[PDB]
Scaffold this active site. Structure first.
Site, PDB file in Angstrom:
ATOM      1  N   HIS A   1       3.450 -34.081  42.240  1.00  0.00           N
ATOM      2  CA  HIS A   1       2.726 -33.588  43.375  1.00  0.00           C
ATOM      3  C   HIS A   1       1.527 -32.789  42.852  1.00  0.00           C
ATOM      4  CE1 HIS A   1       1.601 -30.889  46.525  1.00  0.00           C
ATOM      5  NE2 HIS A   1       2.168 -31.718  47.382  1.00  0.00           N
TER       6      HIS A   1
ATOM      7  N   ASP B   1      -0.156 -30.143  43.586  1.00  0.00           N
ATOM      8  CA  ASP B   1      -0.007 -28.680  43.410  1.00  0.00           C
ATOM      9  C   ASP B   1       0.949 -28.359  42.263  1.00  0.00           C
ATOM     10  OD1 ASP B   1      -1.701 -27.831  45.532  1.00  0.00           O
ATOM     11  OD2 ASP B   1      -0.013 -27.922  46.948  1.00  0.00           O
ATOM     12  N   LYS B   2       2.057 -29.085  42.195  1.00  0.00           N
ATOM     13  CA  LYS B   2       3.005 -28.840  41.120  1.00  0.00           C
ATOM     14  C   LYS B   2       2.447 -29.210  39.775  1.00  0.00           C
ATOM     15  CE  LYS B   2       6.528 -26.423  42.033  1.00  0.00           C
ATOM     16  NZ  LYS B   2       5.985 -25.417  41.035  1.00  0.00           N
TER      17      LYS B   2
ATOM     18  N   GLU C   1      -5.353 -20.279  36.224  1.00  0.00           N
ATOM     19  CA  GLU C   1      -5.289 -21.080  37.415  1.00  0.00           C
ATOM     20  C   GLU C   1      -5.749 -22.505  37.082  1.00  0.00           C
ATOM     21  OE1 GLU C   1      -3.876 -19.540  39.669  1.00  0.00           O
ATOM     22  OE2 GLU C   1      -4.622 -17.472  39.906  1.00  0.00           O
TER      23      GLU C   1
ATOM     24  N   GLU D   1      -8.461 -15.827  33.548  1.00  0.00           N
ATOM     25  CA  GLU D   1      -8.623 -14.811  32.496  1.00  0.00           C
ATOM     26  C   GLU D   1      -7.497 -14.894  31.486  1.00  0.00           C
ATOM     27  OE1 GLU D   1      -7.948 -13.671  35.859  1.00  0.00           O
ATOM     28  OE2 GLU D   1     -10.064 -14.191  36.321  1.00  0.00           O
TER      29      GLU D   1
ATOM     30  N   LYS E   1       7.727 -36.070  47.937  1.00  0.00           N
ATOM     31  CA  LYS E   1       8.223 -34.867  48.596  1.00  0.00           C
ATOM     32  C   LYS E   1       9.536 -35.167  49.319  1.00  0.00           C
ATOM     33  CE  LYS E   1       5.055 -32.325  50.663  1.00  0.00           C
ATOM     34  NZ  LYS E   1       3.988 -31.957  51.640  1.00  0.00           N
TER      35      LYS E   1
ATOM     36  N   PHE F   1       2.719 -45.507  50.825  1.00  0.00           N
ATOM     37  CA  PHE F   1       2.378 -44.349  50.039  1.00  0.00           C
ATOM     38  C   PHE F   1       2.117 -44.859  48.625  1.00  0.00           C
ATOM     39  CE2 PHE F   1       4.249 -39.876  48.745  1.00  0.00           C
ATOM     40  CZ  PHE F   1       3.041 -39.522  48.167  1.00  0.00           C
TER      41      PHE F   1
ATOM     42  N   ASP G   1      -4.933 -36.001  47.501  1.00  0.00           N
ATOM     43  CA  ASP G   1      -4.722 -34.632  47.948  1.00  0.00           C
ATOM     44  C   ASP G   1      -5.058 -33.663  46.813  1.00  0.00           C
ATOM     45  OD1 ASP G   1      -3.738 -32.615  49.721  1.00  0.00           O
ATOM     46  OD2 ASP G   1      -1.721 -32.676  48.803  1.00  0.00           O
ATOM     47  N   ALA G   2      -5.896 -32.665  47.077  1.00  0.00           N
ATOM     48  CA  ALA G   2      -6.229 -31.684  46.060  1.00  0.00           C
ATOM     49  C   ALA G   2      -5.013 -30.839  45.709  1.00  0.00           C
ATOM     50  CB  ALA G   2      -7.315 -30.752  46.567  1.00  0.00           C
TER      51      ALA G   2
ATOM     52  N   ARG H   1       0.456 -22.898  45.066  1.00  0.00           N
ATOM     53  CA  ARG H   1       0.511 -23.406  46.437  1.00  0.00           C
ATOM     54  C   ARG H   1       1.852 -24.033  46.789  1.00  0.00           C
ATOM     55  NH1 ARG H   1      -4.621 -24.114  49.000  1.00  0.00           N
ATOM     56  NH2 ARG H   1      -3.451 -25.526  50.326  1.00  0.00           N
ATOM     57  N   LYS H   2       2.865 -23.739  45.966  1.00  0.00           N
ATOM     58  CA  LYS H   2       4.236 -24.159  46.239  1.00  0.00           C
ATOM     59  C   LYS H   2       5.204 -22.989  46.057  1.00  0.00           C
ATOM     60  CE  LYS H   2       3.575 -28.183  47.753  1.00  0.00           C
ATOM     61  NZ  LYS H   2       2.482 -27.505  48.492  1.00  0.00           N
TER      62      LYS H   2
ATOM     63  N   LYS I   1       0.873 -17.031  34.794  1.00  0.00           N
ATOM     64  CA  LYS I   1       0.849 -15.592  34.642  1.00  0.00           C
ATOM     65  C   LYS I   1       1.832 -15.120  33.572  1.00  0.00           C
ATOM     66  CE  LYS I   1      -0.277 -14.852  39.526  1.00  0.00           C
ATOM     67  NZ  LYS I   1       0.340 -14.332  40.756  1.00  0.00           N
TER      68      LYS I   1
ATOM     69  N   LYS J   1       2.312  -9.559  34.857  1.00  0.00           N
ATOM     70  CA  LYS J   1       2.098  -9.823  36.272  1.00  0.00           C
ATOM     71  C   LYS J   1       3.466  -9.759  36.939  1.00  0.00           C
ATOM     72  CE  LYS J   1      -1.872 -11.294  34.530  1.00  0.00           C
ATOM     73  NZ  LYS J   1      -2.282 -10.896  33.140  1.00  0.00           N
TER      74      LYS J   1
ATOM     75  N   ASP K   1       4.254 -10.100  39.922  1.00  0.00           N
ATOM     76  CA  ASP K   1       4.566 -11.234  40.833  1.00  0.00           C
ATOM     77  C   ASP K   1       5.662 -12.119  40.259  1.00  0.00           C
ATOM     78  OD1 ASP K   1       2.741 -10.735  42.922  1.00  0.00           O
ATOM     79  OD2 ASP K   1       1.157 -11.874  41.898  1.00  0.00           O
TER      80      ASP K   1
HETATM   81  C1  LIG Z   1      -0.351 -35.192  53.381  1.00  0.00           C
HETATM   82  S1  LIG Z   1      -1.096 -34.563  52.016  1.00  0.00           S
HETATM   83  C2  LIG Z   1      -1.967 -33.178  52.508  1.00  0.00           C
HETATM   84  C3  LIG Z   1      -3.028 -33.393  53.608  1.00  0.00           C
HETATM   85  C4  LIG Z   1      -4.231 -34.115  53.005  1.00  0.00           C
HETATM   86  N1  LIG Z   1      -4.951 -33.152  52.165  1.00  0.00           N
HETATM   87  C5  LIG Z   1      -5.159 -34.676  54.043  1.00  0.00           C
HETATM   88  O1  LIG Z   1      -6.365 -34.888  53.687  1.00  0.00           O
HETATM   89  O2  LIG Z   1      -4.773 -34.936  55.215  1.00  0.00           O
HETATM   90  C6  LIG Z   1       0.111 -33.709  51.192  1.00  0.00           C
HETATM   91  C7  LIG Z   1       1.010 -34.536  50.310  1.00  0.00           C
HETATM   92  O3  LIG Z   1       1.601 -35.566  51.098  1.00  0.00           O
HETATM   93  C8  LIG Z   1       1.935 -36.609  50.204  1.00  0.00           C
HETATM   94  N2  LIG Z   1       1.281 -37.890  50.588  1.00  0.00           N
HETATM   95  C9  LIG Z   1       0.056 -38.352  50.248  1.00  0.00           C
HETATM   96  N3  LIG Z   1      -0.152 -39.569  50.766  1.00  0.00           N
HETATM   97  C10 LIG Z   1       0.955 -39.892  51.469  1.00  0.00           C
HETATM   98  C11 LIG Z   1       1.390 -41.059  52.217  1.00  0.00           C
HETATM   99  N4  LIG Z   1       0.567 -42.108  52.296  1.00  0.00           N
HETATM  100  N5  LIG Z   1       2.593 -41.017  52.805  1.00  0.00           N
HETATM  101  C12 LIG Z   1       3.409 -39.925  52.699  1.00  0.00           C
HETATM  102  N6  LIG Z   1       3.076 -38.812  51.996  1.00  0.00           N
HETATM  103  C13 LIG Z   1       1.878 -38.784  51.374  1.00  0.00           C
HETATM  104  C14 LIG Z   1       1.537 -36.216  48.785  1.00  0.00           C
HETATM  105  O4  LIG Z   1       2.693 -35.655  48.134  1.00  0.00           O
HETATM  106  C15 LIG Z   1       0.457 -35.189  49.067  1.00  0.00           C
HETATM  107  O5  LIG Z   1       0.252 -34.281  48.002  1.00  0.00           O
HETATM  108  C1  LIG Z   2      -5.175  -7.243  39.109  1.00  0.00           C
HETATM  109  S1  LIG Z   2      -6.021  -8.631  39.527  1.00  0.00           S
HETATM  110  C2  LIG Z   2      -5.045  -9.965  39.097  1.00  0.00           C
HETATM  111  C3  LIG Z   2      -4.627 -10.057  37.615  1.00  0.00           C
HETATM  112  C4  LIG Z   2      -5.834 -10.484  36.782  1.00  0.00           C
HETATM  113  N1  LIG Z   2      -6.075 -11.906  37.048  1.00  0.00           N
HETATM  114  C5  LIG Z   2      -5.635 -10.271  35.309  1.00  0.00           C
HETATM  115  O1  LIG Z   2      -6.349 -10.975  34.521  1.00  0.00           O
HETATM  116  O2  LIG Z   2      -4.807  -9.432  34.860  1.00  0.00           O
HETATM  117  C6  LIG Z   2      -5.807  -8.807  41.196  1.00  0.00           C
HETATM  118  C7  LIG Z   2      -6.732  -7.993  42.064  1.00  0.00           C
HETATM  119  O3  LIG Z   2      -6.604  -6.619  41.704  1.00  0.00           O
HETATM  120  C8  LIG Z   2      -7.818  -5.996  42.074  1.00  0.00           C
HETATM  121  N2  LIG Z   2      -8.473  -5.340  40.910  1.00  0.00           N
HETATM  122  C9  LIG Z   2      -9.331  -5.871  40.009  1.00  0.00           C
HETATM  123  N3  LIG Z   2      -9.729  -4.943  39.130  1.00  0.00           N
HETATM  124  C10 LIG Z   2      -9.102  -3.793  39.459  1.00  0.00           C
HETATM  125  C11 LIG Z   2      -9.128  -2.431  38.956  1.00  0.00           C
HETATM  126  N4  LIG Z   2      -9.918  -2.151  37.916  1.00  0.00           N
HETATM  127  N5  LIG Z   2      -8.342  -1.524  39.552  1.00  0.00           N
HETATM  128  C12 LIG Z   2      -7.548  -1.849  40.617  1.00  0.00           C
HETATM  129  N6  LIG Z   2      -7.494  -3.095  41.154  1.00  0.00           N
HETATM  130  C13 LIG Z   2      -8.262  -4.061  40.605  1.00  0.00           C
HETATM  131  C14 LIG Z   2      -8.754  -7.025  42.698  1.00  0.00           C
HETATM  132  O4  LIG Z   2      -8.601  -6.963  44.129  1.00  0.00           O
HETATM  133  C15 LIG Z   2      -8.208  -8.307  42.098  1.00  0.00           C
HETATM  134  O5  LIG Z   2      -8.517  -9.460  42.858  1.00  0.00           O
HETATM  135 MG   LIG Z   3      -0.704 -10.800  44.829  1.00  0.00          MG
HETATM  136 MG   LIG Z   4       2.993 -27.909  52.316  1.00  0.00          MG
HETATM  137 MG   LIG Z   5      -0.977 -28.412  48.735  1.00  0.00          MG
END
Ligand SMILES: C[S@@+](CC[C@H](N)C(=O)[O-])C[C@H]1O[C@@H](n2cnc3c(N)ncnc32)[C@H](O)[C@@H]1O
Ligand SMILES: C[S@@+](CC[C@H](N)C(=O)[O-])C[C@H]1O[C@@H](n2cnc3c(N)ncnc32)[C@H](O)[C@@H]1O
Ligand SMILES: [Mg+2]
Ligand SMILES: [Mg+2]
Ligand SMILES: [Mg+2]
Ligand SMILES: [Mg+2]
Lengths: 386, 386
Positions: A14, A16-17, A42, A55, A169, A238, A246-247, A252-253, A273, A277, A279
């Site tokens: 997928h 996103d995965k 990312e 970063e 999926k 499919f 699909d991007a 996003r999961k 991460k 982090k 999270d």
């Molecule tokens: C439906 S798409 C997301 C919406 C899409 N970005 C759009 O432009 O409408 C999300 C996911 O559905 C699945 N997908 C893509 N094509 C499909 C199809 N023809 N039938 C069923 N699922 C599909 C894939 O896993 C894909 O990443």
């Molecule tokens: C801490 S950063 C995420 C982790 C980061 N990507 C890293 O490289 O460690 C997340 C958010 O924290 C906030 N942030 C960035 N710099 C910061 C600072 N100097 N002090 C407090 N918060 C900050 C911003 O809103 C940023 O989008």
């Molecule tokens: Mg957060």
């Molecule tokens: Mg979804």
């Molecule tokens: Mg998605």
């Protein structure tokens, strides 16, 4: 009182995965050379390209582009008709160093035990006695379906399966009864599976294959009945999938990665991460806590929330909810006291205890981070509490 | 029995929220010309660039690059030292048409009322009588703090505020008592705010300003006490911000966008998606349902789950939980029956009822999608139920 509840999962391919896996591949590549790496990697993808961005401050010498290509190759994206070809795609790398202002409040001039949280935020952990994994059944079933498809496709089988493409999926709806907060599954109400395929396999063949070799292998037969609604490839076609349809983006999961709608989520992504982090590390420790409480027989279901502030080691708050399922003599106040005697949510302690500077993360990035048996996921090895 | 719970929010200029806003700006631009547009517009950002990518099928003629630049300009990113400059940044557009295989199971040869869901997935709605907005207090307070900072900075004030830069985050922890499932806030336990600033304002000045002009303006004085922990700019320096310190992506603030950890989340992002993406439309209708049940006095708190399958109009499941707070004579089974007589979760009906083909979405993309008073958010106008 019965009710229906659904959870979903997605295949390794997928889009996103795919991004989660690349982000964690890069994290592991950095950690294997430099355990002290700060990584916030990312990934995003669309037709014919992958971009890695964010970063990283590391001493590792990583060929980021080769890591991306190898990861995509391993997932099976080796041809444009499958949705992406690791050989031909553009790979763009836009990485910079971590902000020094963030670094300054995390580790600079701090004892290892008292490193600051890498950000603010909240994280939840959850456990339930529904399954052996101490995970919700809906999530376990949806995840098992996609994990089985991935195994069939990637490890390989003796049968004709070259028609299976990487994207897919699943979604499972379970009918439950609730007794005193305890969740008793009654039956599986609906099973939905969408699997990417090539242009020559019949819909009837796909459906027979998924029902017999996937659904019936991973879903308990005593929870399926004549009224269970089986929906396999309802779109009817499919073949175009992956980034070509699909991007994809990292993080996003997050609900597939955790509990499938059960418990709660604080909002942060895991993949890409490093363990400063919170999270990620906070959620992993919160899972261990929840799982330990349930495993210990102190309740049937447990939700934990921890929260942090940037640059601050100790958590800002901690919360435990057992949904009224606590064992006689126990309650949520007492359970929080027990948790505080046993656990320490300072990230520096967290990281040490869960071995989170080792390159263990690529394995977490498909299949769910929780309810996993792999020996190295220390957050899944429960502590006995009394 | 008391407990602590936290929720967070981020400023309009937070890099992830910036991406949500751009994605929704593009969606609105398409819809204002072509209400039938299919839009799945993702955005990402890092130092000096924005990329928009995904799938759009539209008759609109949109200058995507100008839309991106205007959106960034409006947020206040007009100089590299603030974290991004709309004038100088690279803007990359990588859009393709929607897959015909997805389009084929959504709208092709289907009655408008019976269009298929744009994907599988689950969505939750939630409401609670804690606040006038029928939202959780922790979320309301964190959101109010960041919304106030954004108002101070963007609309402007008579005081010296040019030191405030666009990025920022807040987190609020509330101590609650729980009576029969009903949540009674007792006090605010911790307030954390991190605000981006320029290089000449004192930390003491920032702290005094945020405490007096933000926290004390939006947090009830009777919930604050001598023991409330106030943490304003704990990192001690936050001048480098925005994409210059942290990568942003669409759909990475899904819990900020919804209920702050309360209720539940099905995993899907809202921004950049037209209303045939049930991640958005299903969640909006689920909110209306939850809010209508609470507003009607039928319970104090309510959680709704709906789920869908791709190409299928009617939901695969529906779930209502009132946490034991239902009014005498009512219960969750009866409430589901009431919901089914009143509401219809088919996307085609959803879309018509909530006016989701109108260009209303940019407003939702900062400040939370729920608990909002703007007349056009029809999902916030409750229906009286009995
Ligand atoms: C439906 S798409 C997301 C919406 C899409 N970005 C759009 O432009 O409408 C999300 C996911 O559905 C699945 N997908 C893509 N094509 C499909 C199809 N023809 N039938 C069923 N699922 C599909 C894939 O896993 C894909 O990443
Ligand atoms: C801490 S950063 C995420 C982790 C980061 N990507 C890293 O490289 O460690 C997340 C958010 O924290 C906030 N942030 C960035 N710099 C910061 C600072 N100097 N002090 C407090 N918060 C900050 C911003 O809103 C940023 O989008
Ligand atoms: Mg957060
Ligand atoms: Mg979804
Ligand atoms: Mg998605
Ligand atoms: Mg983020």
């Amino acid at each position: 009182e019965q009710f229906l509840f659904s959870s979903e999962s997605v295949c390794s391919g997928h889009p996103d995965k795919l991004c989660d896996q690349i982000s964690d591949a890069i994290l592991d590549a950095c950690l294997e050379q430099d355990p002290e790496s700060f990584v916030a990697c990312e990934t995003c993808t669309k037709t014919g390209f992958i971009m890695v961005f964010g970063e990283i401050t590391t001493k590792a010498n990583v060929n980021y582009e080769r890591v991306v290509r190898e990861t995509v190759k391993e997932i099976g994206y080796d041809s444009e008709e499958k949705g992406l070809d690791y050989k031909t795609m553009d790979v763009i790398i836009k990485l910079e160093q971590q902000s020094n202002q963030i670094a300054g409040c995390v580790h600079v001039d701090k004892n290892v035990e008292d490193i600051g949280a890498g950000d603010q935020g909240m994280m939840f952990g959850y456990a339930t006695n529904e399954t052996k994994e101490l995970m919700p059944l809906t999530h376990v079933l949806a995840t098992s379906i996609t994990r089985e498809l991935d195994y069939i496709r990637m490890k390989g089988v003796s049968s004709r399966v070259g028609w299976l493409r990487p994207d897919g999926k699943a979604q499972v709806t379970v009918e439950y009864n609730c007794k005193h907060g305890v969740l008793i599954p009654k039956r599986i109400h609906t099973i939905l599976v969408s699997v990417q395929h090539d242009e020559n396999i019949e819909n009837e063949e796909i459906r027979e294959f998924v029902l017999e070799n996937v659904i019936k292998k991973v879903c308990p037969s005593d929870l399926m009945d004549k009224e269970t609604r089986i929906l396999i490839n309802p779109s009817g076609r499919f073949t175009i999938g992956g980034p070509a349809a699909d991007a994809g983006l990292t993080g996003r999961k997050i609900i597939v990665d955790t509990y499938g709608g059960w418990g709660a989520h604080g909002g942060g992504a895991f993949s890409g991460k490093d363990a400063t982090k919170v999270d990620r590390s906070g959620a992993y420790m919160a899972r261990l806590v929840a799982k330990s409480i349930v495993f210990s027989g102190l309740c049937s279901r447990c939700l934990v929330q921890v929260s942090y502030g940037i640059g601050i080691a100790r958590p800002l708050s901690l919360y435990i909810n057992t949904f009224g399922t606590a064992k006689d003599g126990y309650n949520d106040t007492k359970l929080l006291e027990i948790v505080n005697k046993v656990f320490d949510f300072r990230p520096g302690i967290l990281i040490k205890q869960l071995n989170l500077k080792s390159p263990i993360f690529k394995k977490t990035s498909s299949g769910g981070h929780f309810g996993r048996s792999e020996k190295e996921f220390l957050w899944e090895k429960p502590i006995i509490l009394q």
